[PDB]
Design a protein around this ligand. Sequence first.
Ligand code: HQW
Ligand code: SF4
Ligand code: SF4
Ligand code: SF4
Ligand code: SF4
Ligand code: SF4
Ligand code: FES
Lengths: 196, 127, 166, 180, 127, 240, 384
Amino acid sequence: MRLERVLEEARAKGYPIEDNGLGNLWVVLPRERFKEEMAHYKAMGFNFLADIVGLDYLTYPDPRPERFAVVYELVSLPGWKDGDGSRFFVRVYVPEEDPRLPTVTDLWGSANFLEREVYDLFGIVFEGHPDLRKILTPEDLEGHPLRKDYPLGETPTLFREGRYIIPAEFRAALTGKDPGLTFYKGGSRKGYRSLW
Amino acid sequence: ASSERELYEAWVELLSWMREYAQAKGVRFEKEADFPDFIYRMERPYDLPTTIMTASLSDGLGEPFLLADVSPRHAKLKRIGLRLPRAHIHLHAHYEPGKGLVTGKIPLTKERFFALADRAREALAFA
Amino acid sequence: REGILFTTLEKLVAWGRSNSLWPATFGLACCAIEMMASTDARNDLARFGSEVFRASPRQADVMIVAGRLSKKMAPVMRRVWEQMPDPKWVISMGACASSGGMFNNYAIVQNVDSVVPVDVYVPGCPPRPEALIYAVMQLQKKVRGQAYNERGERLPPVAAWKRTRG
Amino acid sequence: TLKALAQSLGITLKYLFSKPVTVPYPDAPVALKPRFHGRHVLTRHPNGLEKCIGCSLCAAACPAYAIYVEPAENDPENPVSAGERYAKVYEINMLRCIFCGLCEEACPTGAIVLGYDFEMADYEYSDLVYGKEDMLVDVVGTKPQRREAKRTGKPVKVGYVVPYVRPELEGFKAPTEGGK
Amino acid sequence: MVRVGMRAAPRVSLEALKAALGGLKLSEAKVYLITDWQDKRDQARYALLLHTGKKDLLVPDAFGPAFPGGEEALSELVGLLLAQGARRFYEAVVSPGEMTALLDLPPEELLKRVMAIANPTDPGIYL
Amino acid sequence: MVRVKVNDRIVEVPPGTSVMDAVFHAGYDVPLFCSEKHLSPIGACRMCLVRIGLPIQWQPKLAASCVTAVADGMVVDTLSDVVREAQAGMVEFTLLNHPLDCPTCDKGGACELQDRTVEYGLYEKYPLELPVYTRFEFTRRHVDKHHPLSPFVILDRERCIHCKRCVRYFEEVPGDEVLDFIERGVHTFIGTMDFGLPSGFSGNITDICPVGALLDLTARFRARNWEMEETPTTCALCPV
Amino acid sequence: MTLNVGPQHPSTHGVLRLMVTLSGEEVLEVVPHIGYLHTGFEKTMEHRTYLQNITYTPRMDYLHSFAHDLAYALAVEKLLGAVVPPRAETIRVILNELSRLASHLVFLGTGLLDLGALTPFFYAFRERETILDLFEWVTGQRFHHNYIRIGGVKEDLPEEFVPELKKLLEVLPHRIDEYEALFAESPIFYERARGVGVIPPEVAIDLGLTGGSLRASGVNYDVRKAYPYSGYETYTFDVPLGERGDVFDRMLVRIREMRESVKIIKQALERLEPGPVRDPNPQITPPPRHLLETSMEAVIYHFKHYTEGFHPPKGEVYVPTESARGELGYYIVSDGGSMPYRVKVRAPSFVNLQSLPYACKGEQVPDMVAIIASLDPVMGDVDR
Ligand SMILES: COc1oc([C@H]2C/C(=C/C(C)=C/c3ccc([N+](=O)[O-])cc3)CO2)c(C)c(=O)c1C
Ligand code: SF4
Ligand code: SF4
Ligand code: SF4
Ligand code: SF4
Ligand code: SF4
Ligand code: FES
């Protein structure tokens, strides 16, 4: 029941409401109103903070508002006190040269680890965090891996007598910016969706 | 019906004739193409006597003057076809039981094919 | 004294060390559960003498690199190897450890022969518990001096004996 | 709940008298399923011609990229493969290989198919690159197994048994459940 | 970032590196021995990238048993780096054709790539 | 400039523009076999067919966007079920007598027919119903195979889909007409009575042939198009 | 005593480093250090075709992996509109609940061994061994099985699979009842676990503890009930619950989970009628192996699908599922290309670990091991 009131609240304030025909909802809040709005969201009855997923759109084919984007997931468990089951996402873009974000650790302690990961994997420093310390990657690791300008850092495959492979030169699969092996890719290799 | 079997079997005989001409007149013969429904059978069974589907007689300069082809194992309107490149000449041969290999109703004897190949050699071959 | 310098005693002590191989588990990833399964009540490496399992490194000779060796764990495991008595052997278990495996990136050591001297390599994902029995038998006959490679050479009894530690 | 100690004791005793459950490899042949992921085998047609046409569809779909295929053109007099193309060099780095079945799944000629050997433990990285003539169906045993049988003079016995071998393994000779 | 030493001259590379090293303390530095072909060290050739954090140093492929005195020069080199207190050792595996162009890429790209691809190593494999 | 509209997008475009360039300029896509850059378009493959309205007055038949000029205020439809249906049908007609040589084909992954077939082929017919790929189950066309046209070029007349690119090139670009068809109907095939391929610019058709017909002998059977490591550079044999 | 309970030593299964800030035999607070298995799925998966990634998916949680396979599969099916045949769906729920039984067996065996007795590790493991055979029957692999596909499953079930499954399903209920008879009326475990492991549901909710450890504290929150995905809407189901969150209630609730999962295996087994095996859409499914020698479209689609892959439309998607450790999901960003733009995994064992300093605070020092075994981490899931 509360998701409908979330939509009525955000649409009334002019925040874009993103929706795919698959049943998952995105709500993009600006940087300023982010902290206070999501505090109100927790107050709205959102027990559970599932995910903090950081995104780097540097090499995305279509342009996007900002390079980095952090998405939180707010949920209210159905089997708890008064559970509607309302689950939704909050996306907040973070500039390329301004990797800031206030934490919701004070509201949910789950953002203790999760935000650290996004600070570990991406250059995004989370404001108000108790401890922003590298979680996963080695302590001496320099950089933030999951951003596209950061190498995957592969090693060749090895064979008998000088015969080797460089997989990035071996891949027949295409990314989004890869034009393809012919002059171009159109039709079903530019995106295909069956109509049930 | 079962005539199918002899067809492919008869096909091998045909190849022999073709091969013979190369050994006779000293002109290059080549196996052009094998049966795809024989290459791409992985575990599936294959009972046919041979896997070769297309062959040709090439001159010294490499251009063939006589082409022979057979219908694949699963294709409809099974036949054998013959062609002279550059000469707009095509033949549709079947096999009628007891009689032998017939171009329509006219039996296809080895002598007929041999004379045809020699006429092609004198006419179409460049070198 | 290295178990050498007597026609009888080197055979005897190689017999002893080879059959009484006491593994030192370093459970890392999904290879390591296939290492654990090699001890249950269907297919147990609890017969050749590996019944007991010295978790302390000061007491065990066989160290099995069992799983993907993430780089943040490379030095620790290194010292775990240096925290072993000198008559020690190391088997490299799996594809992630032997070579880089399928994870060909910044996070994985692409061959654990880098950090530790490997005795036996055992491919598989994970190598079947029975392949692990075959590798421990490979190492069994290797440390008796009963091992030859493809190139025609007999292999030394103990690898990690030929390295200038530092 | 003192009774639970006694109940635990009693059931452990009942299992004590229950002797059987275990299988003693290598003395007892390991029971494998017919679909098991083992050492790759290259299968051949009835004509004897090899099935591999050297098309590198196995190598591209490999998530580790462990498969190497140098091609070449068949010699009409003594051809190796069915088409105009064969595999001069076929290497698979078992230390890269993760045993998916993607090379089996993508092979259009049914040449590359996983076998059943797991007894491929060796000492050297450089030696664990299993080649073409190291995987043919004609071969019976793994690299260390064949080297041991040669430096030993004693024939090869594989330590596994399966109920039957698949039709995709036409030609794969192996011990089948005890039929022999 | 400086480039000292020269390809295929192990002894000159070693002496120039002796001089350019000086009394530089390597307590927090990183040594990347870049090569090709992980397994075969008997025929290995080696480059070195020394990442101090405050300035970086390059040595082209001049060490290893592949060159006369590259094995003894690499042993002396690792002994020299270890004397000065180095603890963090890495090895990078590149395709042979990379090794040449990797010394001509800008410092940020070359160094980022090397740090991403580095394997912790036991220096005993080079001593 | 001329105003054109493709399905939701409006583009300024100079007047002599072909409907195909305007469609791609707007961001949509449509197959292409017969026409090629720097080659005179002539409607042969009939793949570039679109729908055109020129006021809502749709043209009766699908316009060949390869040889059709553009006019101001024209609407172009490439996403209607009719267009995709017709395109799949023409793909079937093209694949009709093909030899099934993809796995051993030297063209490998960089083959235009493969990509346009998987792009536009097999329109979603209207279920979990089992589909059939091909209707043509008759005897296919067999002609001479792996025919060396010159010490660098090899010719497989079965893989030819009867476009005009090689003969059009030879007539237009070098001025050496040393390649053209022989017979007509479905029996048509490329041939020559000039065998050495005298033109010194003969190798470029090696790239143009959307199929594996004309291939490089000196690089025959080495690796597949993706397996090769592609490094773009500049040739320094001569000053161009 | 800031004691270094190091990675893998002493017997911290699932390599994990602990700085136990602790004076005496109590427990003040445990500071964890993870990442010692970081291998790079979220990054490597950005360079592998959707078809390939099914080889990367099971190996993250190597115990309950088909949940990973199913989550990835379902998310991509929704993203490109794939159709689940009924038989494929039934088989997928079979393999899901069976891998859940196997993961549960390993979890309780590890918990008992981690502090306490060694014997009951084997018996449960015995059954696990049998289960593996079932998998080896259909997939040819013990675990890490690459069987699932986007449309459905790779190929059909063998003739010999179902009777073996019936055998194991008939022997198991007595076995699970035996484990519960041994453990529930706990002799010493009663005085070991009923008190320990303070789990206030409020903070368990606040820290992101979904993995079956929360319903041991009395929260009825399961994705199979909250968000039916694979036909769980159509099952008669008992949903385990706990009175007060401790180690004892956790273990008992998971044992009842095993019995309910066996019941679901049987239930799905009965309703199984022959039919198709995967989504026949050629753009999404490679051609059948038999018409590779008849049709051109077959060869082109096989070549393309097995070199390039397929291109789903541009968009982001995410769908959750319930594994033996709770809510799991893949955030898939696709840019319309043959390789996914990004895959972010909600690792239940990753956040379920935030409750380590809390739960074992004031508990015993040894019980810091039993409370970790009871937390059920899979450091392939955490480190990732
Ligand atoms: C515990 O579970 C697990 O372990 C591991 C690692 C640690 C490990 C330890 C011991 C102590 C084995 C062992 C077991 C039995 C004996 N024995 O003598 O009987 C000896 C040794 C083996 O793999 C991993 C990675 C894991 O992710 C899970 C869930
Ligand atoms: S080789 Fe396979 S089973 Fe072993 S650690 Fe690697 S992914 Fe896991
Ligand atoms: S089984 Fe998988 S990892 Fe092994 S060679 Fe085949 S595709 Fe590659
Ligand atoms: S093994 Fe099969 S897939 Fe690989 S190159 Fe040979 S024919 Fe092609
Ligand atoms: S030209 Fe293209 S479609 Fe034809 S066989 Fe070659 S790869 Fe296949
Ligand atoms: S040979 Fe190639 S370029 Fe020439 S007409 Fe045929 S398909 Fe076109
Ligand atoms: S492109 Fe060939 S028809 Fe216009």
